[PDB]
Structure formats: structure tokens, C-alpha cells
């Protein structure tokens with residue numbers, strides 16, 4: 001069902017796209033959220049995915065945190081995909097703007113290996129403060145399952161492809 005992606009490796013594909021619009025079109029089995037440990041979906045990819053669910057993602061997430069407590073940086077949980085996907089894999093990459101350890105980015109991407117195919121953003125990019133070129137390299141060197149990366153910024157997409 002994924003179309004228009006550029007093949008980077010045997011299992012990693014990339015496209016300049018809005019992940020909300022991509023999820024609505026494909027209805028993938030798994031969409032990845034760029035979550036924080038509290039599952040507070042305020043901004044970035046998480047704010048956009050939650051807004052597209054009419055806040056149902058945040059209501060489910062608040063019940064999950066009330067029962068389980070916060071996730072670990074580098075960890076994940078599987079919740080509903082609502083109207084976007086069958087499932088949402090909420091993955092916590094390190095937030096460099098909060099002083100978190102960038103080495104945890106490889107542990108964050110290892111969560112993707114529990115799912116055969118995923119629609120995902122680049123972890124720790126954007127408002128999480130990491131270098132997206134680095135994030136793409138860790139993705140390619142860590143994920144072994146089939147990952148379809150949606151890169152929102154056209155200018156960054158071009159830089160990622162040309163420097164790969």
C-alpha cells in the first residue's frame with residue numbers, strides 16, 4: 001500500500017510527506033509516534049497525530065499512564081491507532097533539548113524490530129533536538145524490519161537523500 005517512496009536499503013524507504021496524511025491514506029498496521037515518557041502529545045509529530053484523532057489518542061494515553069506510570073527514554077508501548085492505523089507504537093527517543101543521552105537513540109529504534117512493517121518519523125528529530133542525518137543512520141543500522149519513513153520538511157528530505 002505504500003507508494004512514492006525512495007528505497008535507501010533492503011528494508012528502509014523514505015518519502016517527503018506529512019505522516020498524518022500518509023497514515024490516513026495507507027491505514028498501516030503500525031504508525032510510530034514520536035512520544036515522550038508521559039505520553040503528553042502536545043506538539044511535533046505527537047501533537048499532529050493526536051489532533052488527527054480528535055484527542056482520542058490523548059484520552060487513551062492518559063488512562064495508560066494512570067495505570068502503568070511513565071515509559072523509559074528508549075522504550076515504547078503499543079496502543080490503538082484510532083482512525084490512523086490498526087496500532088500506534090509510541091516510541092520515546094532521547095530529547096537533546098531536555099539533556100537526554102543521544103546513545104539511547106539506538107535502543108529507541110530497536111522497538112521497531114518487534115513489528116514487520118511500520119510507517120514512522122525519524123526519532124529524536126525536530127523539536128527533540130537531535131541531528132536528523134544521525135537519526136537516519138542509526139535507523140538504517142538498527143532496524144531490520146520494513147520501515148517507511150515520512151519526512152515532513154522538504155528541505156530536510158532533500159538533504160537526507162543527498163547525504164546518505
Ligand SMILES: CN(C)c1ccc(C(=O)N[C@@H](CC(=O)O)c2ccc(Br)cc2)nc1
Pocket residue numbers: 018019020043044045048049121122125126127132150151152153156
Ligand atoms: C505536523 N507534523 C506531521 C509534524 C510536525 C513536526 C515534525 C518534525 O519536527 N519533523 C522534523 C523531521 C522531519 O522533517 O520529518 C523536522 C522538521 C523541520 C525541521 Br527544520 C527539522 C526537523 N514532523 C511532522
